[PDB]
Design a protein around this ligand. Structure first.
Ligand SMILES: [Mg+2]
Ligand SMILES: [Mg+2]
Ligand SMILES: [Mg+2]
Ligand SMILES: [Mg+2]
Ligand SMILES: [Mg+2]
Ligand SMILES: [Mg+2]
Ligand SMILES: [Mg+2]
Ligand SMILES: [Mg+2]
Ligand SMILES: [Mg+2]
Ligand SMILES: [Mg+2]
Ligand SMILES: [Mg+2]
Lengths: 176, 141, 38, 132, 163
RNA sequence: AGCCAGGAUGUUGGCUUAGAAGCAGCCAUCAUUUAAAGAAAGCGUAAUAGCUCACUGGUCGAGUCGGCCUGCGCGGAAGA
């Protein structure tokens, strides 16, 4: 329903290789990408992808909409690519990158060296910003999470790895 | 006009300009000199008369002092010199304390010729009407 | 978080979700509104 | 008209930008700043100080504050051993800051120091016994 | 609010402001501030007043289905967001310039001034109307005829002829 | 429902007010500026606050809202 009942428009360029229950999309950039579905039946035809339920499944629609959105983000995936961005806060922090493994300094007694996964690269335009583009939305989102994790933002001064979409409450300490 | 940059308003009466005990280190602490608040004020304050409360903007940049463009006074304090009691509310609506009329407060609404959101010289009448009813004053229009 | 047997949203930013077999309140403004066992 | 040496203590601690520290000293104390040494990293990342006039880098060792540590120098400001000993990342920030420093500071002049018009600024840590 | 009745109402009134109207300006208002009202209503203190309104009624379906008061070529004048400006008393002059110099100060887009009724058509801000009660522009317009256009050509040789 | 906007002026209301200029406080809640804007929702201020909410316009384009009568399930639920 709705998101499901919506189109998808396969932008002139993406391969769209529907093999039964396996869809594989490649284009511009991005190492292909190929997920699976279930109670949803997908149909190519024309310049789009249609997503609908399938009698016998009450999951229908709900499984179909997530199909849409997923598939949707897969097109765009290899098309525009995918965003990122985290900034470090607090004296003595800062990140590195030196290949495909980011080196982090976060006030521990040791560096951290986090190693990027497959289809996702990142640069440090600044000592204190990590920007990581990739095709797989589900994965950038992770590596972001995973990075920010080494030092989530403490709610007193704000030190730690934020996103930018951050909100950091920050509050005063108990009175004396 | 723009928006926000620097401005406040914390005084008591023009009768005693630039006070120390009432406000002091509270009359301005951001770019305002406590002693320099008796030069540009009385340059026009003592120029008309002292007594009525006079708040004003505090346009502050980074050029030493500050610049305040003054305008009109509170139409609520005009009930201690030009209406009745030295106070105001005290005992609000538990008894018909004070009472003004249509006649009075007329030339009080007339003075604010650059401070009225109502081109209608008649509409800007009921605006101060409430300014003389926020303590329990009946109106004999 | 609170593990009361009645959960109840409190603020207006308090959500109420079921993750796993368990009802929870998720408040975005206040974390004191975070709840399980509902 | 008494002359002032300046020592920036507590580089073991997380501190302010030493650039900004120079502003606060010139602006609020009404006296010129002439950096002699310059910190490389601060807090957990204090690695030592680069001497501007001797052109070499004394390397800080952690916790030898009770005696005098081993004097361990790295000669060039572009010596690829400064990169190795300090990490090439921190090493470039030293190089960057030093660029800005030269365009916004002062050469130490003995006459102006004795006249109380510039201060030789040393960065260090009296606790780590480094910079003293 | 209300239903179909409240609907018609806003229209017949808002559209009688176009029938009985002296003038008409259509201004899209992306990022419309309250300072916005604080302007056309400030330029109403000592230069205008209540003789002007500007109800953002791009309700379209409303302000438009409700111009059987004769407002053709306004289906084209119904795109995107707009803030209808309608005149009742006073000349049609000054009101136009107000927006012309508002939006040009940033003050929100002006919909490229899609133009409106009175003459009845499209887009192209002119200056007919605002030049009125400034007939000293007809004093200066005579250009002294015999004399000013004289001391400019019949008398411009000397200051530029001895080459 | 999102997303784009806006949310003032009499009025810093006077007030048991050390200081109170919407929100520990009192009582009042009236009238304008207009498409909407409450002396009123929130964070929380040395006091201004800064930034955000009811309510109205825009985008989108077919439903959406909460009670009622009923069937079957969830949590609540720790012991040798
Ligand atoms: Mg779990
Ligand atoms: Mg500290
Ligand atoms: Mg409507
Ligand atoms: Mg809506
Ligand atoms: Mg909003
Ligand atoms: Mg206050
Ligand atoms: Mg109060
Ligand atoms: Mg308060
Ligand atoms: Mg209305
Ligand atoms: Mg709403
Ligand atoms: Mg049951």
């Amino acid at each position: 329903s709705r998101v499901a009942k919506a189109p998808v428009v396969v932008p002139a360029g993406v391969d769209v290789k529907i093999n039964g229950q396996v869809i594989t999309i490649k284009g511009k950039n991005g190492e292909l990408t190929r997920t699976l579905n279930d109670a949803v039946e997908v149909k190519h035809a024309d310049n789009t992808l249609t997503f609908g339920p399938r009698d016998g499944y009450a999951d229908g629609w709900a499984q179909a909409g997530t199909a849409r959105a997923l598939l949707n983000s897969m097109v765009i995936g290899v098309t525009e690519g995918f965003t990122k961005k985290l900034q470090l806060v607090g004296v003595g922090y800062r990140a590195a990158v030196k290949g495909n493994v980011i080196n982090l300094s976060l006030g521990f007694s040791h560096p951290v060296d986090h190693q990027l996964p497959a289809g996702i690269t990142a640069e440090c335009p600044t000592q204190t910003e990590i920007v990581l583009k990739g095709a797989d939305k589900q994965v950038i989102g992770q590596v972001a999470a995973d990075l920010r994790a080494y030092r989530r933002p403490e709610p007193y001064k704000g030190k730690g790895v934020r996103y930018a979409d951050e909100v950091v409450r920050t509050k005063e300490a108990k009175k004396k | 006009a723009k928006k926000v940059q620097a401005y406040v308003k914390l005084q008591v009466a023009a009768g005693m300009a630039n006070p120390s005990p009432p406000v002091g280190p509270a009359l301005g602490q951001q770019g305002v000199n406590i002693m320099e608040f008796c030069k540009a004020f009385n340059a026009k304050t003592d120029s008309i008369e002292k007594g009525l409360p006079i708040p004003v903007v505090i346009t502050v940049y980074a050029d030493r002092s500050f610049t305040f463009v003054t305008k009109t006074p509170p139409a609520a304090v005009l009930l201690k010199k030009a209406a009745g009691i030295k106070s105001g509310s005290g005992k609000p609506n538990k008894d018909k304390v004070g009472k003004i009329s249509r006649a009075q407060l007329q030339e009080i609404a007339q003075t604010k010729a650059a401070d009225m959101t109502g081109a209608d010289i008649e509409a800007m009448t009921r605006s101060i009407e409430g300014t003389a009813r926020s303590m329990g004053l009946v109106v004999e229009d | 978080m609170k593990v009361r047997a009645s959960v109840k949203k409190l603020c207006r930013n308090c959500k109420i979700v079921k993750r796993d077999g368990v009802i929870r309140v998720i408040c975005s403004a206040e974390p004191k509104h975070k709840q399980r066992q509902g | 008209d008494t002359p002032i040496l300046t020592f920036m203590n507590k580089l073991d601690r997380d501190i302010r930008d030493p650039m900004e520290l120079l502003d606060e000293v010139e602006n609020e104390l009404k006296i010129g700043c002439a950096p002699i040494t310059w910190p490389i990293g601060c807090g957990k990342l204090f690695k030592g100080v680069y001497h501007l006039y001797k052109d070499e880098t004394y390397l800080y060792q952690s916790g030898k504050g009770h005696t005098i540590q081993e004097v361990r120098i790295v000669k060039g400001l572009n010596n690829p051993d400064l990169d190795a000993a300090v990490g090439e990342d921190l090493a470039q920030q030293l190089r960057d800051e030093l660029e800005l420093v030269k365009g916004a500071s002062n050469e130490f002049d003995k006459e102006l120091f004795l006249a109380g018009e510039i201060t030789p600024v040393f960065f260090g840590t009296a606790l780590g016994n480094f910079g003293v | 609010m209300a239903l179909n009745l409240q609907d018609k109402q806003a229209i017949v009134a808002e559209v009688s402001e176009v029938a009985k109207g002296a003038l008409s300006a259509v201004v899209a208002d992306s990022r419309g501030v309250t300072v916005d009202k604080m302007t056309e209503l400030r330029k109403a203190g000592r230069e205008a007043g209540v003789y002007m309104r500007v109800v953002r009624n791009t309700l379209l379906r409303r302000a438009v289905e409700g111009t059987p008061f004769e407002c053709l070529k306004d289906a084209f004048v119904g795109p995107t967001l707009i803030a209808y400006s309608m005149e009742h008393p006073g000349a049609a002059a000054r009101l136009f310039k107000e927006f012309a110099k508002a939006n040009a100060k940033f003050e929100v887009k002006a919909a490229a001034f899609e133009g409106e009724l009175i003459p009845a058509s499209q887009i192209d801000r002119l200056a007919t109307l605002p030049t009125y009660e400034e007939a000293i522009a007809r004093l200066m317009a005579t250009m002294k005829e015999a004399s000013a256009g004289k001391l400019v050509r019949t008398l411009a040789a000397v200051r530029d002829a001895k080459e």
